[PDB]
């Protein structure tokens, strides 16, 4: 996240860290057995980190779990980052409590200028490198699709949108991805894309959740 703010130790209680030896994406509990992410970030062998906040240190309230299945969406496609969503089912439930707690879905999808927040532990800096040890957080409209789409010279699908600053400064980067886009409570963006971080006219692009409800419901009752 570059320009945001550290977000306060589980103050974003469905914020997990996925990690396979070290932290690599972000993601979002929607129940005590399943973990909402990317699919840009499928990895073989992740383990979920829940309750985190200074990802480098056992604070007390960490949950790991292993995942025990992976299920990237049947249409992902890594040309275009069309359908960049992944299901995350771990080994055991989690136990939830006040800092490990489940993000609901959306029923309707948010509309242009409605306020999110997006979260993770990505760089921090829009030019060089400063990775952060605690949660950062960023709160962030969603943007016209149709700036959204003059931004790029690449596509952006109806199963993506906007959020963040044409202006530059505030964005989600690398390191962020898979992680949050929630409005009103509700999970509506998985950080997906952008051109570099928090360029001017390159705001970030988000997989628009809302377009998954059913695959995510039926997938979770199946498996
Ligand atoms: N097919 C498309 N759409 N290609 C455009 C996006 C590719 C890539 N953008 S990028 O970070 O590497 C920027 C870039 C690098 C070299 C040359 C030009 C621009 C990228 O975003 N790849 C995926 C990735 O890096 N995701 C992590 C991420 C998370 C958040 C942001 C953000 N600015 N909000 C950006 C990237
Ligand atoms: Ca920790």
Redesign the pocket.
């Given at each position: 996240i570059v320009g945001g703010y550290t977000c306060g130790a589980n103050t974003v209680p469905y914020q997990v860290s996925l990690n396979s030896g070290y932290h690599f994406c972000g993601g979002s509990l929607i129940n005590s057995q399943w973990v909402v992410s990317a699919a840009?970030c499928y990895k073989s062998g992740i383990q979920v980190r829940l309750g985190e906040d200074n990802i480098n240190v056992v604070e007390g309230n960490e949950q790991f779990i292993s995942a025990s299945k992976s299920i990237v969406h049947p249409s992902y496609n890594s040309?275009?980052?069309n359908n960049d969503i992944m299901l995350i089912k771990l080994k055991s439930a989690a136990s939830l409590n006040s800092r490990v707690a489940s993000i609901s879905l959306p029923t309707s999808c948010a509309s242009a200028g409605t306020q999110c927040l997006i979260s993770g532990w990505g760089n921090t800096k829009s030019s060089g490198t400063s990775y952060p040890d605690v949660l950062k957080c960023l709160k962030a409209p969603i943007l016209s699709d149709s700036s959204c789409k003059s931004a790029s010279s690449?596509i952006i699908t109806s199963n993506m949108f906007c959020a963040g600053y044409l202006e530059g400064g505030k964005?989600?980067?690398?390191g962020?991805?898979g992680g949050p886009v929630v409005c009103s409570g509700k999970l509506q963006g998985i950080?997906?894309?952008?051109?570099?971080?928090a360029q001017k006219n390159?705001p970030?692009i988000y997989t628009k959740v809302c377009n998954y409800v059913s695959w995510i419901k039926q997938t979770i009752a199946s498996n």
């Open positions: 840009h040309e275009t980052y690449f964005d989600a980067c690398q962020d991805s950080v997906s894309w952008g051109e570099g971080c390159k970030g």
